[PDB]
Amino acid sequence: MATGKIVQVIGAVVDVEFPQDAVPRVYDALEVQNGNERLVLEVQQQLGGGIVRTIAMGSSDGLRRGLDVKDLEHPIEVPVGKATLGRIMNVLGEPVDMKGEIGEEERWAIHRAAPSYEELSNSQELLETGIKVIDLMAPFAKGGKVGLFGGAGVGKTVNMMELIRNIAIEHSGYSVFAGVGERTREGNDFYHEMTDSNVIDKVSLVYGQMNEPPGNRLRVALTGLTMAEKFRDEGRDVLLFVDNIYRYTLAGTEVSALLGRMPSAVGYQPTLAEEMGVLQERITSTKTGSITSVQAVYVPADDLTDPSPATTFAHLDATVVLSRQIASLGIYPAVDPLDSTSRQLDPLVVGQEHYDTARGVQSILQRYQELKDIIAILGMDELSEEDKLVVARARKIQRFLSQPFFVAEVFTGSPGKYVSLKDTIRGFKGIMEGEYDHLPEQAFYMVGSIEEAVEKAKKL
Amino acid sequence: TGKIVQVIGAVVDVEFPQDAVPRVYDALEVQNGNERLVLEVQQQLGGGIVRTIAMGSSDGLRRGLDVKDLEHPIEVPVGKATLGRIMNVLGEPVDMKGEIGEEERWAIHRAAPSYEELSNSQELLETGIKVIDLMAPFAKGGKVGLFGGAGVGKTVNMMELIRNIAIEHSGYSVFAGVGERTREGNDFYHEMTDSNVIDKVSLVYGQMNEPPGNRLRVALTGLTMAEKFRDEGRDVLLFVDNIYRYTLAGTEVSALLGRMPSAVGYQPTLAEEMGVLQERITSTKTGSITSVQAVYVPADDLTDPSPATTFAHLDATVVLSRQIASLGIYPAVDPLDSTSRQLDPLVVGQEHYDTARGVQSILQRYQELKDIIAILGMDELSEEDKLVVARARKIQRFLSQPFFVAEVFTGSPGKYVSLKDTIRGFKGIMEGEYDHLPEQAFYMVGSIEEAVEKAKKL
Amino acid sequence: GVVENLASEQAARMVAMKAATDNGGSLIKELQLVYNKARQASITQELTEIVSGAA
Ligand SMILES: Nc1ncnc2c1ncn2[C@@H]1O[C@H](COP(=O)(O)OP(=O)(O)O)[C@@H](O)[C@H]1O
Ligand SMILES: Nc1ncnc2c1ncn2[C@@H]1O[C@H](COP(=O)(O)OP(=O)(O)O)[C@@H](O)[C@H]1O
Ligand SMILES: [Mg+2]
Ligand SMILES: [Mg+2]
Numbered sequence: 001m002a003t004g005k006i007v008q009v010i011g012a013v014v015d016v017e018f019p020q021d022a023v024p025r026v027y028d029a030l031e032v033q034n035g036n037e038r039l040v041l042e043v044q045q046q047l048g049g050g051i052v053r054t055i056a057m058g059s060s061d062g063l064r065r066g067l068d069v070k071d072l073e074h075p076i077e078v079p080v081g082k083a084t085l086g087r088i089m090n091v092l093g094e095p096v097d098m099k100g101e102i103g104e105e106e107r108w109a110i111h112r113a114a115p116s117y118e119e120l121s122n123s124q125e126l127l128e129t130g131i132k133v134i135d136l137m138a139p140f141a142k143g144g145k146v147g148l149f150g151g152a153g154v155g156k157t158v159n160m161m162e163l164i165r166n167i168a169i170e171h172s173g174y175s176v177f178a179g180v181g182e183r184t185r186e187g188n189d190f191y192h193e194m195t196d197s198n199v200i201d202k203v204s205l206v207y208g209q210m211n212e213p214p215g216n217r218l219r220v221a222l223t224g225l226t227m228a229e230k231f232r233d234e235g236r237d238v239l240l241f242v243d244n245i246y247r248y249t250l251a252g253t254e255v256s257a258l259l260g261r262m263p264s265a266v267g268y269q270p271t272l273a274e275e276m277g278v279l280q281e282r283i284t285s286t287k288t289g290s291i292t293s294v295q296a297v298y299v300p301a302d303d304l305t306d307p308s309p310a311t312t313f314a315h316l317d318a319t320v321v322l323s324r325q326i327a328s329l330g331i332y333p334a335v336d337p338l339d340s341t342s343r344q345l346d347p348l349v350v351g352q353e354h355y356d357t358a359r360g361v362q363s364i365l366q367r368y369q370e371l372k373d374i375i376a377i378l379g380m381d382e383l384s385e386e387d388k389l390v391v392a393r394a395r396k397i398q399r400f401l402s403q404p405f406f407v408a409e410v411f412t413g414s415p416g417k418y419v420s421l422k423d424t425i426r427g428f429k430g431i432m433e434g435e436y437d438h439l440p441e442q443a444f445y446m447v448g449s450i451e452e453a454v455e456k457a458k459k460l
Numbered sequence: 461t462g463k464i465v466q467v468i469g470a471v472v473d474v475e476f477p478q479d480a481v482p483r484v485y486d487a488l489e490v491q492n493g494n495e496r497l498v499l500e501v502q503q504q505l506g507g508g509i510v511r512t513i514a515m516g517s518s519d520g521l522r523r524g525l526d527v528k529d530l531e532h533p534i535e536v537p538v539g540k541a542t543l544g545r546i547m548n549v550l551g552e553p554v555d556m557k558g559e560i561g562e563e564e565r566w567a568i569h570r571a572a573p574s575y576e577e578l579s580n581s582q583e584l585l586e587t588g589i590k591v592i593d594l595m596a597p598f599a600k601g602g603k604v605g606l607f608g609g610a611g612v613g614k615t616v617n618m619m620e621l622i623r624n625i626a627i628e629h630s631g632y633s634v635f636a637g638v639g640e641r642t643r644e645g646n647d648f649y650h651e652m653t654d655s656n657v658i659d660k661v662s663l664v665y666g667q668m669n670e671p672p673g674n675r676l677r678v679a680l681t682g683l684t685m686a687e688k689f690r691d692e693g694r695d696v697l698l699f700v701d702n703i704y705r706y707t708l709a710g711t712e713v714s715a716l717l718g719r720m721p722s723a724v725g726y727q728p729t730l731a732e733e734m735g736v737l738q739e740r741i742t743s744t745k746t747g748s749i750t751s752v753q754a755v756y757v758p759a760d761d762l763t764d765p766s767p768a769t770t771f772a773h774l775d776a777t778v779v780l781s782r783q784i785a786s787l788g789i790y791p792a793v794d795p796l797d798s799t800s801r802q803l804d805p806l807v808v809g810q811e812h813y814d815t816a817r818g819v820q821s822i823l824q825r826y827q828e829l830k831d832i833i834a835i836l837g838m839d840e841l842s843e844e845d846k847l848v849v850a851r852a853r854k855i856q857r858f859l860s861q862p863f864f865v866a867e868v869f870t871g872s873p874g875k876y877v878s879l880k881d882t883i884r885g886f887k888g889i890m891e892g893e894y895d896h897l898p899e900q901a902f903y904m905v906g907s908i909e910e911a912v913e914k915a916k917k918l
Numbered sequence: 919g920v921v922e923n924l925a926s927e928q929a930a931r932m933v934a935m936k937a938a939t940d941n942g943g944s945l946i947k948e949l950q951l952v953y954n955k956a957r958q959a960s961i962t963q964e965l966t967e968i969v970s971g972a973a
Contacts, residue, residue, distance in 0.1 A: 262972060266964075721970050724963070834945065836938050 004069035012060050012213045013258050014041055016069045017051045024052055024071045027111050032069045035062045040092060042076060042215060044259055055215035055255060057092060075111045078223050079104030080230035084204040091208050091220045108230060110222040114281040121287045124349050130166040130418040133335045133401045136358055138342045139350055140318040142237060143285025146294040150322030155334050156296035157186060160241050161193060162405040163294060167239055168199035170418060174231050175239045178224025179207040181217045181247030193407055217251035225282050232289035239292045240283060246298040249308045268307045280315040318342035331402040337365055357429050361397055364432060368394030396431050399444035417448025426450060462527040470518055470672045471716040472499055474527050476508045482529050485569050488512060489528045492520050498550060500534060502717060513713055515550060515673040533569050536681050537562030538688040543632065544659040549666050549678040566688060568680040572739035579745045582807050587624050588876035591793045591859045594816055596800040597808060598776035601743035604752045607767060608780030609760040612792050618699060620863045621752055626697050632689050633661045633697035636682030639675040639705025642667040676709040683740055690747040698741060698749050704756035707734060707766055723765050731769050738773040776800040789860045796823055815883045818890050819855060826852035854889055857902035875906035
């Protein structure tokens, strides 16, 4: 039976009134027949007598007052398990790829409490990603979080595609991709790239596209989280990719403004720092398994200080900042080595070898920054014999950080390269010791591993 | 038949029988003591209540007064008989002469002409002002706007344009004074009358003394008169003395009409209030309206919503600035911010266009150097950047001109400079053929010959 | 003559950099008036947009 009735519709916000015996709880899901179609509503507030204010998870058009509404007496709950690998799903766990029903055994509610501080476990096993600059300058451990900061067009999304491809191919680990506010063009390119690279069978995808109401864009992060949690309980180590935190916070701001809450610091909702914690606190490694996360975060207008990026910093363990200047000189992955950072970069965890290589590289690049502006004025011949050496080695090091990705082959035709951490440390530590002072600079550009620089120098 | 039921400031609420309620924009009438007050209804609330704005002083109104429903909008005299006379917002005569012997009356609320009727005219219109018709020339039938803060010269400029166009022009002309000083309306009325051009100019005044209703509706009256002259087949000049007061008078009334505030306290309907006016002031196939509008900029902030939404409605925008007037350089036009639709090679010719673009280029390059000049002084400049700075300052001086209406302020007599005579002078200054004169040789002169002369006398 | 010109160059650079440091200091105090005015304007606009949205 259907005990409720709609009493208002204002845009995406729908009020439904039930008999006072059977008011839905908060976050319950209701259901209504929007013409020849089905629409689910999520309860946000129990206000007044029998009346409940909700957000529509779909287009609100065509809703009349007085329609019959039925309350599913449970939150929105989605399919989980192995059945979801290789599928695309919307916030409600329905397939949007036309391959038919999901086939799931089990469904989990997307609202659940985070682990208690004693269920956690801290283990410092570094992830190996296969990207030179990331492994070297910004190591991150299982269970930790990484933030790809930067403006627009720098490479956050293709860097995440590359990380997914490596993890899936070279380490056989599962992955989940939550497209919070995803551009359908990029979502389709991502689908065809994952299926062409032959990794789709180890990723499960969730898309809340931009053309969907705010409620869809908001709750998608929790659906991706719930799938990643199901994989964790099986004892696996999964990796959760969130395609933009900035659009999670924007969907939260819109949902807040619709419900009429009194706004806050720069138009952001009041609950901003609580939504961010509700999300980021379920991503942890427990004694049974581990969820690692890497998260793209758009910085609007380069200021790193307005609430949206400012609040997320509190939760990250490493930060990789991408720069459009570096990208325009053509050295992708476009990671800035000097501003990217990690909490795990200290000797007690990465060993003295890796630590000294990282700090030596940063010091050489920092010195080349100084020498650039003398080279500009006095010309280069006014440099010492040693300083011309720092210059040549800094330029080689700066070439060597670039790498050809497997997913970028569509842009440049060049085949991709996967570089282990041993090769990274060995190559950089060799360059900084004058072992390769006889090769030309361009021998190191987009070359992958160090042993392929000596091969490329023969051909130049 | 109606009763007053509330009086908040300038807005009055009136209660009518259920079936007798007035339509929007109808006019009601009250007897405020030994006075007759006109109310224009703005909104129909539920239950026979109707909300109005008082076209007069609101004081003295009790609750429960009886108001009479006149069944028509505000209508104003129009046509040839309204010519050479001063009128109220309600179309009443305000000079001490007799009644206006009009044959016809029009409602001040009208729809803008259809897209099918509009007309387009590249016919350039010369004004003897160097900066305006070098940088931002305008055409017969086009719209011009003078943007500026308080006290920078956007009324003196409008009176000089009146002098240079509206005496040397045959058709009729209209002047609407929206929310400005009555002193200046009187001075203008007598300047006209003491030179016998008054009997081809029609005046409407809603000056700043008057309560918000008058300043709110007085622009539509001037437009209605101009539209009558346009439809007769003539071509008309319409000068509006400050169009910013037409929206400020809306901001004053807006909150009392029960509308939620918007960006900087402005009414939520700002862009529509402004468009539904600016859209009926246009030329058409049957006749043309040429206009000049003074547009006040609050707090000198050109990004304020009210100036910002106006730039889109004008063809030539002349942006005056305080940081130039306080150098004594009049007219204080900013050439890096003035602009015209007509400044195309295909409309003004390659040489005029190219001179204007070169002048903008020099003055912009001079703006870029001001910070280094301010920190490190002028001696660190390249040997050719000092030359750019010298020619830029010479160009800034030469943009100045003595107006005929500004004799009262400076003694020096006015000058009229033709276009042929100004592009020549600027081409000269740019090509370097006057590098030997001092800057002051250029300040406040007519053509370039008068500068070459003033240099002899220092 | 060369050595005297060099000493003269050093003295002129000293006094020119003195002038430039004073010119920078006198410009900080203009930029701070601008900054304060903008700070106040933003506080006012934000707090009005909150209070006037309620109810
Ligand atoms: N490693 C790369 N190789 C080649 N092209 C790249 C690479 N990274 C970024 N690009 C270029 O940048 C564009 C957008 O990159 P993307 O990562 O989507 O930016 P954003 O981080 O803003 O999403 C791509 O279309 C591609 O042309
Ligand atoms: N061509 C000019 N020569 C000298 N002074 C001028 C000239 N144009 C404007 N001014 C000065 O501009 C001042 C501002 O007057 P006005 O134009 O009425 O400002 P507003 O535009 O606000 O009405 C005048 O008092 C006058 O001294
Ligand atoms: Mg992206
Ligand atoms: Mg004035």
